[PDB]
Design a protein around this nucleic acid. Structure first.
Length: 45
DNA sequence: CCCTGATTCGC
DNA sequence: GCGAATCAGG
């Protein structure tokens, strides 16, 4: 439910594949599409 | 209605 | 650092 290194790795892979924030949120669990978009920004993607 | 990312700022 | 709740649209 937190941005572990494992979950960040998954986010980067899926985002760089072009999956939408809601899709990634559903894959990960424990986060909304808002959380995903916020994290994408803090990662500088 | 379903959906998209972007931003602010209290927490 | 985190993410809800707008914003701004498709």
């Amino acid at each position: 439910m937190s941005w572990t290194d494992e979950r960040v790795s998954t986010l980067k892979k899926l985002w760089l594949d072009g999956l939408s924030a809601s899709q990634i949120a559903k894959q990960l669990g424990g986060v909304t599409r808002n959380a995903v978009i916020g994290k994408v920004h803090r990662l500088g993607l």
